[PDB]
Structures are given as structure tokens and as C-alpha cells.
Design a protein around this ligand. Sequence first.
Ligand code: CL
Ligand code: CL
Ligand code: CL
Ligand code: CL
Ligand code: NA
Length: 79
Amino acid sequence: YTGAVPRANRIVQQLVEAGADLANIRTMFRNMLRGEEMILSRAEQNVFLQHFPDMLPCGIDRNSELAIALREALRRADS
Ligand SMILES: [Cl-]
Ligand SMILES: [Cl-]
Ligand SMILES: [Cl-]
Ligand SMILES: [Cl-]
Ligand code: NA
């Protein structure tokens, strides 16, 4: 399956593979959607670039299906 939800789950999977702290990523991403750059490891950055290719010059659109799905997935994993 390749909808926004399985894709967001893949992001979370890759983040944990990369040693990320999901609580931290959740906070970082919430701030990204507000417009603040994330402080990421090279590994964490590379995960995000696989899924949000224009992130560095353009930020991430909080209304995009994938950003919504990732917001949801990070919240659910962080409960
Ligand atoms: Cl998608
Ligand atoms: Cl690299
Ligand atoms: Cl792609
Ligand atoms: Cl909460
Ligand atoms: Na995207």
C-alpha cells in the first residue's frame, strides 16, 4: 500500500531505524509546520529528504496529506 498513511508509517520506521527519538521528532515536526527549521542528524535529515524533497528551500506544507499523516503517526507513537 502507498497511501499517505503507509508512507508516514515508513517515515516513522526509518526514523527509528536511524536512532531518532520520536518524542523529539514530534516536537521538531510540529515546529517545522509552524515554519521553524528542524535540527536533525544527517541520518534524520536523509529520512526526511526521501519524503519531503523540497523541505530545505521550501519548508513543509501542514495541509499536505503526508504532513497530516506524519503528524498523526508521530502523535500515536508518542502516546
Ligand atoms: Cl504520500
Ligand atoms: Cl548522506
Ligand atoms: Cl517518491
Ligand atoms: Cl499528548
Ligand atoms: Na511530500
